[PDB]
Point group: D2
């Protein structure tokens, strides 16, 4: 109900997710940036029984950057929390790992942050 | 074939994963450490068509720290790569996000690294 | 000139820095949050000869969370870049490491992000 | 005494540091890898009064990747802890930020880990 929907980050990327009663996140990610084109499968987990003390719902998900059209040979993971209310928000940090040789493996992982809203 | 199996990190945690032809990672994670007990659902993605130039296979997965017995109100995501061969290895970095209030949200996310092997 | 001044993050923390011609950052950090009180020494480095193609100036600094009044047994490092202009900005990611036992060393390092402005 | 000396990471990079009574880290970093050549200035902070319960000494430092010969337009920060004894160790996580345009700023920051020893 809270986590299920279409979400928009600060850089124009669309996250369409369903939050299953089991704790399963399933969906699609459409990336407005990077070496990516069009629509990619999303899987993840959330806290299906969160704390009743104004605390956020912990969640996470993975996109492997491969569809029928593109393969970037990379995967992003987002770790974050859902803050429910009027201005509903998913505050995340992410790791983008690229498939490298063992000589290039030191420089394989980019780190960043995304804030997602239900407002396009 | 390569990614499918039972994997062991440096701190004694067991990762039992199946790598589907679609790019789906499904499994269980058993955590030897932290505010955790017993067995937790794992979902993730991998690069199902990796590069043929000695480069690793990009992957990632999520565990929400909630089963039938425990709820830590937290989720870990691992971002990494599979290096195939005799000494087969998953080199990862991870983000552990805890469900917090907006006052505690600065301190919500632990970062670290895990190396997983097929040797117990 | 650009980097030298008083800077304010999103959570009300004050960063007073001098950018030396050698590439040295020296200053004080006053933390509005965490297990901290009052004023702490800052040292760091910046790119003293940045690129002339609209690119930001790479920098970084360290605060050990120990003064004459408090010791949190911890250190934060910020890694980022200075974007110069009318709305002058330091966009950073940070690592906060706490002094732990080898049993607690997995959970020693918090990760986050700060944006600093010259507007209080 | 403990932190003062010559340190060697897993990838052959040399860290020569002095730990001042004030909490100041001063030195040189010689990087065996990346778009770097030869010797670079290091500044940082450590916990000058650590806990007496077998806990590590929190520290951190910055290298801006600019000397008289090279400028990579980038800075690394290491956040970590000193574990003293027979097999003396600095366990770190690091952030490498590159000077980018605001279009490339999502991909500006690499994350990783280094373990440093006093054995070449
Ligand atoms: O460039 C690549 O290697 C593949 C595309 C990566 C897209 C990145 S992942 C972090 C950030 N979140 C997004 O909305 N997309 C970018
Ligand atoms: O303590 C918690 O909040 C829940 C358990 C967390 C387990 C952590 S996640 C990173 C690391 N990988 C493991 O094998 N388990 C620990
Ligand atoms: O709580 C502690 O262990 C010591 C204080 C930490 C202050 C943190 S560091 C990251 C962030 N930046 C700030 O302005 N202060 C907080
Ligand atoms: O390639 C660059 O942009 C400059 C050189 C970076 C060297 C990296 S920083 C992290 C790691 N630690 C080292 O010993 N050097 C590499």
């Amino acid at each position: 109900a809270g986590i299920t929907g279409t979400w928009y980050n600060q850089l124009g990327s669309t996250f369409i997710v369903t939050a299953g009663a089991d704790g399963a996140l399933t969906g699609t990610y459409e990336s407005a940036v990077g070496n990516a084109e069009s629509r990619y499968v999303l899987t993840g987990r959330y806290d299906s029984a969160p704390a009743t003390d104004g605390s956020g719902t912990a969640l996470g998900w993975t996109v492997a950057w491969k569809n029928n059209y593109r393969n970037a040979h990379s995967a992003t993971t987002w770790s974050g929390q859902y803050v429910g209310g009027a201005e509903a928000r998913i505050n995340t940090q992410w790791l983008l790992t690229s498939g490298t040789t063992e000589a290039n493996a030191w420089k394989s992982t980019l780190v960043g942050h995304d804030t997602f809203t239900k407002v396009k």
